[PDB]
């Protein structure tokens, strides 16, 4: 009641009422997912076309932060937008000084969480729509997986969804995911925990998953340097995500 | 209502956040001042529950505001801690541009004062803490005593209690103290003081905090061992004069 | 009502309306007639400044301002806050001036004025204004005439018209179209500006008024707008009350 | 509904404020001033009042300048604020252009400052209405300033508490007073007549006047004791 | 009601304010400090669980703010990040500052005022966390305090907070040993946060830990949080696993 | 309602009932009168007394606002801190640019020119100070233009010359009593033995001097706060007096 | 010249082979006076050695400086600062200033953990990217240790072969310039064991 | 539901989401305009009504299609008030845009940052959303034809052809047969007025009303530039379809 009319004052079971209600916002979104592997990350997420005309092939729902962390989100579209561009502005200035290439992944995570805790804090504020989940790959911590909760806290995952059909794609993953997986393997499991959600429309067209692994140094745009690396994040067309469609 | 803001009184002239701060006054640790003629000594309650409760870091309930004048508290603890900091830096500040000794009078006029001036605003509230100041001037063999109050009120007393159970010990000491002869003794002076903070803790002299203030830049800080001392010579005097009673009854 | 929707003017209702915002054009309507009528080489602006007792003195209060020496500008509703719309509206007048070393076009000024209501319903802390303004001028394109609404919405016009005895304004003004389809020539238009504001004042019946005409016209006033006082406008007084009659 | 009798910020239902119209009432509850003028001179007489006999009673004239001046019928404290910006203009206009401040631009200023507190959320709306006399190139005038902010140039005209009968006097002789022109003694009399009618259950006294006249030939002087008793 | 503002008093002559922060530590995770002479240890419980959790590479509710201090978190895991961040801001200005380490009661003592000086000043929350200190500094050795969501702190040898703290403060004074050890710290913080979780097998992917010694490799403070397997060593010398 | 709750809203009355409250503020606190008569003026004040360790004569409640100025004072002393540094600084400002005396009334426009703060802000006065002030002082002093003036400085309106007024929880019969005894044929001695012959009576304590605090302006002796035993001898010659008649 | 060149000292920096060597003289003058025959140049975060040459108030507050913006990145990240990436940072927190700027002349050294390589750079006032794999020499004696350090270079050098390298052209180079000298004192990083040992030279 | 909610954007309902954004998606049936926005294969097209119910009110100064800068058009349609205060920003950005990063504003980064714009406005109680539907058309030179809508919420997303207003499904639905049967998102001709031919053809049909010369208003994006179309040039297409 109160509890949620202001922000300052609590439920006296914990927790604002506008924490539970930005949980339901992230429900009423997509469905994404990730799931970490030793060799890789599969990040997937369907995307809504939401008119026979709407182009989704326009604008992707996986969208990269810098070139070794991709980012997607189950939530309010509008409140996505922004957030991201803030991603990628303190991402150079917080590291692409400091250690002048792109940040680790942790360290992104933890610059995010401050933004979401603010407008948690006081009133004549709202929190985010979305809950993020942040995938990205550097070489102090290895490959990484994220959860970034619009609360202000954030919680590091092996796999993890959120969305619509959350509660549905948690049990299929507890199941199917084992020890070592491959990327490949990763890939098979994204497509069925997110089919159980949408069926009826299930093509690469219309459903977004792409991976990061290794660098390309054919998205790097340059070549003939030892030590480059090209990005970690790749984008599969919608051919390529046929390929793996057929192989269920 | 008019307990809504600092900017609306109700029609009897009060404000109900100070009135709830006197009431939050009572909820924390007890406090007595009680002057001699070369002495103030500044007693308080010292709150220990559990033995791993230590006495050594814990937060002391007695604060040097400078080395001649000293502020104990009462009320909220958590609210009392930024008063604390505030009047030790204006304690030195006061030295840094005059160059003299910090002044009682004028310490607790400030002190009060930044008070005064969130009661004053309506967007930040005071502490619903109450202080007593008591000190000596290296200009002064003549004792002063103060309060503060949660409004902005600056007073003087001759002796006060405050906070947890006031009640009962301020007409104990009404009696006691003379304003003929305030305790010219200053080991009385702390007697009367152990026998006022006695009531009020019930059983206890690791629960008494006593501490003394004299003339020309002294203080100490009492050990454990000194209060139970008194303890011990109170009780029997306590105990001495009760058992007489009874024999004035026999006699008749 | 309730359930917010007029409460403030962030709030908006399922309707496609704020009823706040209707109840400040009802301040327009209780305000007194104002007319515009735009030409094919002036503009005229009229107002009716009702005499509620003789204590008042005669041609000294007026809702005719202007604006440069070549912009007219005339307000409805409440009066100060009218006055106001014109104090702000000279403060923008003057930074193009000084800037561009050029009179204001008419429409660069229409765009500047709703700006300033506009900003008054993005904030809870700002009460909008209630006040149309009728409004133009002659410029390098020649005469144009524009309304103002206290919504902040805004369209150019060929007659204009406002206040509480508007209903027969608008009336004239439409007569107006069929008689001449170039809107009345400017020196013709400061006689038909003041029957229209006769048959206004029928409206208005209990009390007396005061006319005041302005002008700007192209070649008849040299590109410059002053206001019609002398034997102009008693010329102009003589036709209204003849045609009424 | 009355749930715009709090905002200031929010038309209610009829186009107005309720804040605004409360303020007319500030000024009903007000002390009585009574304007008039001719082309060479404008007077304004007020009532000075007081709690008791132990009063030394309240200036109702403040002088805003030697040609200008005001007096006041509302709230005393909305009074001082608008007081210091008017002198502050005066002043303004004899340091930067060696000007006398027309009667008429004076008021289209304290307009604005209205109307800036009935757009904003902070600080209290003005609810004193003050009536303006000034001598300038253009004669003497004399204006109505409410706390609307709307300004209105008559011949005579009145403020305060019961001046229904002040209106009815001047509009009797509205134009007695203007074939009389430089003689300050006729003009002065004609206030204090007005404002006998104006009260209802009180008598003027002495002390109870204070009238204050600029013209072309008199300097701006306030007239007290022994100067007003010649005109009681 | 008073919930408007933080500007307001309840007629207790606190705030309800206050009271709902409280509340907010006893629907987080347990967490314990227990000093003794020869080191300290720090636990908490984690308060989310699963096995797709990554929980084994990391914790949450440990940080380290200058390597002779440590804290543990109960509470909401919105409210810490913040708070911590500024601590470790200003230990890092002792050090610039004063050419030393930062004393455990000033530390406390700063985080203490800032908390009250939400409630203070404005309409903005209190802060609802309680956080254990578990220190060292040359003048009065080992410390152990926390910190109030009210903020105040008080000093310890042993403490609890989180869920049950007065189910669990019982049981710590009951078993506690005089001169203590550092190795008893360990082996009675297991024992303790196993009857106040609702798990009847507690576990080391369930706990977070760092011991805090100087009693070995002395002359210097070493800090260590634990690695997920020594976790599971302790817990099989108190019988659990 | 809607009223109360705001700085910023009118009532039907015209007036805020934050101005309102703050008179019945000053009521609450201790009885004050002044007296003025063409000698010095007189300043008299009460103090109570429910404790026997409270310490009345170490505190004041009469000041000195410079040195030939002093005030009386009654409500809360919250509101009379601020009150009373503010016209410190106001005299002393003044010997600083003219280097001569202040007068009496310009000291008054100052203290009530801080009363006008109710709020936060406004146009044409900063405001900072958040609530009306629930204070007021009777203002004393000498100017040599005029001779001995006392004036009361209200925080809820501008200032109101006396002759004689008194304030505070008894300042309703002792104005009644100041009417039939205030006379211009009084003398400085008289002008103390009435303040007490007063001060009593609405005093729900016995005439002491514990309670109660005498001072004069005399320009000649500069403001001089009086002895305890001064006003002790007092209340016996008092007493004494009304014995016999 | 600069203030730089007025308080002087020298600090240099070598790569061999898997190794680094980064040594520093003990003088510290300001101006004619000679001041301290002890104050070491050598600082560290973790295993990153940050020597400083300059004026003596710089020596002391980068220090300060550096150490805060560290320990920072130690806590957050759980692992040592990186020689590749405090080369990023020493240039952009130097460049802070530039209207102030601080009047120092640094050299990095340490060996990366991520690969074994060594790693050696140099700066200026407000500091550029200087990559070596050789030598990064600074100070007021730079212009005397360039040449001397590349005369008595002989690439791939063993962790043994390094330390009479940096000795012998540490020696001469200070004891024959007027600011530098008195006393020096060599760190040969082997490859995480540091061994220290101090150069026995005249007092310059 | 409602306690605190739809009075809000700061304050959430029980979905999560905000009443108060979602009912000036109802805003568009008020002002009762329907656009059209159609793609060509080298141009982009936008046609909306022009509605002009009085005599007093010129047809040239009631227009909905505006010039926001040299290659960029819009259509608004629904609230004036909320109309003005898009159109402002859009064309102080566009200009400041196009010299800082010397660029000519794709209609992918001027929908873009608008967007951004109106999600800033719901996130303070200060300030609103705007009421408006804006369409942005462009021909761009790293896309060629374009057509993004940026809606009051703050979302943005591309449309091989997008209709508003309160009959807007009934054209929606007519553009869908179209471009499904032939299998191209483009009507195929290539010359710039034979595509304006056979979207006029395509509303007529669909809302069911014949439409004048002063009942339209056509803005055409060719390669580089915007330009608006006259009366009289309009009714020059009309005729076109009516006459075969």
């Not at chain 3, 020196?187 to 019946?205: F, T």
């Not at chain 5, 984690?46 to 929980?55: A, G």
Request: hydrophobic share 35%; with cysteine.
């Amino acid at each position: 009641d109160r509890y949620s009319f202001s922000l300052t004052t609590f439920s006296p079971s914990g927790k604002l009422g506008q924490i539970d209600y930005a949980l339901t916002a992230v429900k009423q979104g997509v469905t994404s997912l990730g799931i970490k592997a030793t060799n890789g990350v599969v990040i997937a997420t369907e995307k809504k076309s939401s008119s026979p005309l709407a182009m989704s092939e326009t604008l992707s729902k996986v969208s990269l932060l810098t070139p070794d962390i991709g980012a997607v989100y189950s939530g309010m579209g509008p409140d996505y937008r922004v957030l991201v561009d803030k991603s990628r502005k303190v991402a150079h200035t917080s590291y692409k000084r400091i250690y002048g290439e792109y940040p680790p992944t942790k360290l992104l995570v933890s610059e995010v969480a401050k933004i979401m805790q603010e407008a948690t804090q006081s009133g004549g504020v709202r929190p985010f729509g979305v809950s993020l989940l942040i995938a990205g790959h550097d070489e102090f911590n290895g490959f990484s997986l994220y959860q970034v909760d619009p609360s202000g806290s954030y919680f590091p995952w092996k796999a993890t969804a959120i969305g619509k059909g959350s509660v549905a794609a948690k049990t299929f993953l507890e199941k199917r995911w084992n020890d070592e997986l491959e990327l490949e393997d990763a890939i098979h499991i994204a497509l069925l925990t997110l089919k159980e959600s949408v069926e009826g429309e299930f093509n690469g067209d219309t459903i977004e998953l792409a991976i990061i692994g290794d660098e390309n140094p054919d998205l790097l745009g340059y070549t003939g340097i030892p030590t480059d690396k090209g990005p970690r994040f790749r984008k599969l067309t919608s051919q390529e995500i046929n390929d793996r469609l057929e192989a269920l | 209502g008019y307990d809504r803001a600092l900017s609306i009184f109700s029609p009897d002239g009060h404000i109900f956040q100070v009135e709830y701060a006197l009431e939050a006054v009572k909820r924390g640790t007890c406090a007595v001042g009680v002057k001699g003629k070369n002495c103030v000594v500044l007693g308080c309650e010292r709150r220990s529950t559990l033995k791993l409760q230590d006495t050594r870091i814990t937060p002391s309930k007695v604060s040097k505001i400078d080395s001649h004048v000293v502020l104990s508290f009462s009320g909220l603890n958590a609210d009392s801690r930024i008063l604390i900091e505030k009047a030790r830096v204006e304690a030195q500040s006061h030295r840094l541009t005059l160059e003299d000794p910090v002044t009682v009078e004028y310490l607790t006029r400030y002190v009060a004062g930044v008070q005064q001036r969130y009661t004053q605003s309506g967007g930040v509230r005071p502490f619903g803490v109450s202080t007593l100041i008591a000190g000596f001037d290296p200009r002064d063999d003549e004792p002063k005593l103060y309060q503060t109050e949660p409004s902005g009120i600056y007073s003087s007393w001759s002796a006060q209690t405050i906070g947890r159970n006031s009640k009962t010990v301020r007409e104990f000491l009404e009696k006691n103290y003379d304003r003929k002869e305030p305790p010219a003794t200053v080991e009385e002076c702390v007697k009367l003081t152990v026998r006022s903070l006695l009531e009020v803790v019930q059983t206890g002299a690791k629960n008494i905090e006593i501490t003394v203030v004299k003339p020309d830049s002294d203080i100490v800080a009492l050990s454990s061992e000194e209060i139970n001392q008194y303890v011990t010579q109170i009780e029997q005097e306590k105990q001495e004069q009760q058992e007489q009673d009874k024999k004035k009854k026999s006699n008749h | 009502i309730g359930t917010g929707y007029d409460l403030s003017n962030s709030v908006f209702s399922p309707d496609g309306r704020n009823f706040q915002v209707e109840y400040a054009v009802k301040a327009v309507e209780n305000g007194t007639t104002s007319i515009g009528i735009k030409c094919n080489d002036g503009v005229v602006f009229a107002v009716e400044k009702l005499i509620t007792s003789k204590l008042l003195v005669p041609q000294k209060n007026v809702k005719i301002q202007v604006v440069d020496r070549h912009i007219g500008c005339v307000y409805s509703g409440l009066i100060p806050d009218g006055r106001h719309l014109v104090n702000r509206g000279r403060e923008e007048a003057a930074s193009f001036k000084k800037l561009y070393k050029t009179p204001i076009p008419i429409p660069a000024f229409a765009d500047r004025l709703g700006q300033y209501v506009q900003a008054h319903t993005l904030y809870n802390s700002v009460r909008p204004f209630g006040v149309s303004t009728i409004f133009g001028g002659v410029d390098k394109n020649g005469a144009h005439l524009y309304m103002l609404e206290p919504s902040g919405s805004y369209w150019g016009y060929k007659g204009a018209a406002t206040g509480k005895g508007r209903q027969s304004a608008k009336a004239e003004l439409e007569k107006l179209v069929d008689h001449h389809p170039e809107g009345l020539s400017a020196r013709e238009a400061v006689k038909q500006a003041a029957k229209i504001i006769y048959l206004a004042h029928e409206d208005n019946k209990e009390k007396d008024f005061e006319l005041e005409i302005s002008w700007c016209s192209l070649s008849e006033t040299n590109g410059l707008h002053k206001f019609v006082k002398g034997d102009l406008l008693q010329e102009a007084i003589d036709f209204a009350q003849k045609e009424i009659n | 509904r009355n749930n715009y009798d709090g905002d200031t910020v929010t038309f209610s239902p009829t186009g107005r404020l309720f804040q605004v119209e409360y303020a007319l009432e500030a000024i009903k509850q007000g002390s009585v001033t009574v304007g008039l003028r001719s082309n060479t001179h404008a007077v304004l007489v007020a009532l000075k009042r007081n709690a008791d006999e132990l009063s030394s009673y309240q200036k109702k004239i403040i002088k805003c300048d030697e040609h200008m001046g005001l007096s006041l019928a509302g709230l005393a404290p909305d009074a001082r604020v608008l007081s210091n910006y008017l002198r502050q203009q005066c002043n303004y206009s004899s340091l930067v252009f060696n000007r006398k401040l027309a009667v008429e631009r004076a008021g289209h200023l304290l307009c604005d400052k209205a109307q800036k507190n009935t757009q904003s959320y902070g600080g209290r709306p003005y609810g004193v209405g003050l009536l303006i006399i000034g001598y300038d190139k253009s004669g003497a005038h004399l204006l109505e300033f409410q706390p609307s902010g709307n300004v209105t140039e008559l011949y005579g005209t009145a403020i305060g508490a019961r001046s229904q009968g002040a209106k009815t006097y001047l509009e009797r002789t509205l134009d007695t007073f203007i074939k009389i022109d430089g003689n300050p003694d006729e003009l002065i009399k004609a206030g204090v007549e007005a404002i006998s009618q104006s009260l209802r259950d009180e008598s003027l006294t002495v002390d109870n006047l204070s009238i204050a006249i600029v013209g072309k030939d008199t300097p701006f002087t306030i007239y007290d004791g022994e100067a007003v008793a010649k005109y009681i | 009601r008073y919930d408007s503002r933080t500007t307001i008093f309840s007629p207790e002559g606190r705030l309800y304010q206050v009271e709902y922060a409280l509340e907010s530590i006893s629907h987080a995770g347990t967490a314990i400090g227990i000093m003794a002479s020869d080191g300290i240890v720090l636990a908490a419980e984690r308060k989310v669980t699963s096995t797709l959790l990554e929980q084994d590479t990391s914790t949450e509710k440990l940080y380290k703010l200058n390597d002779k201090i440590a804290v543990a978190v109960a509470g909401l895991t919105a409210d810490a990040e913040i708070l911590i961040n500024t601590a470790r801001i200003h230990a890092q200005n002792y050090l610039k500052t004063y050419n030393e380490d930062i004393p455990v009661e000033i530390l406390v003592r700063r985080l203490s005022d800032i908390k009250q000086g939400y409630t203070q000043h404005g309409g903005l929350r209190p802060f609802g966390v309680s956080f254990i200190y578990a220190g060292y500094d040359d003048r009065y050795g080992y410390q152990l305090y926390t910190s109030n969501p009210s903020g105040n702190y008080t000093g310890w040898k042993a403490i609890s907070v989180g869920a049950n703290t007065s189910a669990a403060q019982t049981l710590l004074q009951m078993d506690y040993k005089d001169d203590m050890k550092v190795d008893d710290a360990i082996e009675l913080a297991l024992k303790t946060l196993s009857k106040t979780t609702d798990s009847s097998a507690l576990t080391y992917d369930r706990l977070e830990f760092a011991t805090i010694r100087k009693g070995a490799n002395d002359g210097e403070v070493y800090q260590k949080i634990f690695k997920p397997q020594e976790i599971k060593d302790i817990l099989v010398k108190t019988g659990i696993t | 309602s809607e009223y109360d709750r705001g700085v910023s809203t009118f009532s039907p009355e015209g007036r805020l009932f934050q101005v309102e409250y703050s008179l019945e503020a000053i009521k609450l606190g201790s009885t004050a009168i002044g007296i003025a008569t063409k000698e010095g003026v007189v300043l008299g004040v009460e103090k109570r007394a429910t404790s026997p360790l409270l310490e009345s004569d170490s505190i004041e409640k009469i000041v000195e606002i410079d040195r030939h100025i002093g005030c009386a004072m009654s409500g809360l002393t919250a509101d009379a801190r601020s009150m009373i540094e503010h016209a410190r600084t106001a005299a002393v400002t003044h010997n600083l640019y003219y280097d001569e005396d202040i007068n009496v009334e310009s000291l008054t426009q100052s203290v009530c020119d801080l009363a006008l703060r109710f709020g936060e802000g406004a146009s044409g006065e900063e405001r900072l100070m958040s609530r009306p002030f629930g204070v007021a002082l009777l203002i004393a002093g000498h100017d040599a233009d005029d001779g001995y003036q006392l004036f009361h400085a209200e925080p809820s309106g501008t200032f109101y010359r006396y002759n004689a007024k008194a304030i505070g929880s008894g300042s309703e019969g002792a104005q009644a009593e100041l009417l039939n005894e205030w006379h211009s044929s009084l003398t400085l001695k008289e002008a103390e033995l009435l303040v007490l012959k007063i001060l009593k009576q609405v005093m729900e304590e016995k005439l002491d001097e514990n309670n109660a605090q005498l001072s004069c302006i005399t320009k000649q002796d500069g403001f001089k706060i009086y002895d305890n035993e001064k006003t002790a001898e007092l209340i016996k010659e008092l007493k004494e007096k009304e014995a016999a008649e | 010249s600069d203030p730089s060149s007025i308080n002087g000292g020298i600090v240099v920096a070598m790569t061999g082979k898997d190794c680094v060597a980064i040594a520093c003289d003990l003088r510290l003058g300001s101006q004619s006076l000679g001041v301290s025959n002890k104050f070491e140049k050598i600082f560290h975060y973790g295993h990153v050695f940050l020597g400083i040459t300059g004026l003596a108030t710089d020596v002391t507050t980068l220090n300060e400086m550096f150490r805060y913006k560290t320990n920072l990145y130690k806590l957050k990240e759980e692992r040592a600062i990186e020689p590749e990436t405090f080369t990023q940072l020493v240039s952009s927190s130097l460049y802070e200033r530039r209207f102030g700027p601080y009047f120092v002349g640094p050299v990095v050294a340490g060996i990366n953990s991520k690969s074994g390589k060594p790693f050696i750079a140099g700066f200026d006032l407000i500091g550029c990217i200087d990559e070596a794999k050789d030598f990064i020499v600074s100070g007021t004696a730079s212009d005397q240790l360039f040449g001397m350090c590349e005369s008595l270079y002989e690439p791939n050098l063993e962790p043994e072969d390094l330390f009479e390298t940096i000795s012998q052209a540490l020696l001469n180079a200070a004891d024959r310039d007027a600011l530098s000298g008195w006393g020096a004192v060599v760190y040969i990083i082997k490859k995480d064991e540091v061994v220290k040992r101090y150069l026995k030279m005249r007092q310059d | 539901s409602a306690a605190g909610y739809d009075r809000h954007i700061t304050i959430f309902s029980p979905e999560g989401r905000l009443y108060q954004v979602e009912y000036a998606f109802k805003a568009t049936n008020q002002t009762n305009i329907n656009s059209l926005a159609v793609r060509g294969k080298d141009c982009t097209v936008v046609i909306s009504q022009k509605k002009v119910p009085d005599k007093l009110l010129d047809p040239t100064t009631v227009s909905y299609i505006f010039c926001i800068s040299r290659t960029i058009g819009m259509v608004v349609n629904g609230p004036i008030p909320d109309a003005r205060n898009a159109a402002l920003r859009a064309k102080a950005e566009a200009a400041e845009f196009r010299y800082k990063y010397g660029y000519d504003m794709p209609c992918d980064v001027l929908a873009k940052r608008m967007a951004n714009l109106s999600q800033i406005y719901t996130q303070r109680a200060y300030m609103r959303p705007l009421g408006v539907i804006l369409t942005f058309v462009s021909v761009d030179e790293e896309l060629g034809p374009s057509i993004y809508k940026t809606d009051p919420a703050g979302y943005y997303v591309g449309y091989k052809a997008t209709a508003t207003g309160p009959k807007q499904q009934e054209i929606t639905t007519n553009l869908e047969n179209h471009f499904k049967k032939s299998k191209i998102d483009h009507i195929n001709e290539e010359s710039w007025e034979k595509v304006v031919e056979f979207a006029i053809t395509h509303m007529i049909d669909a809302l069911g009303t014949e439409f004048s010369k002063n009942d339209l208003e056509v803005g055409v994006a060719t390669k580089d530039k915007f330009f608006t179309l006259s009366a009289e040039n309009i009714e020059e297409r009309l005729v076109a379809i009516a006459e075969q």
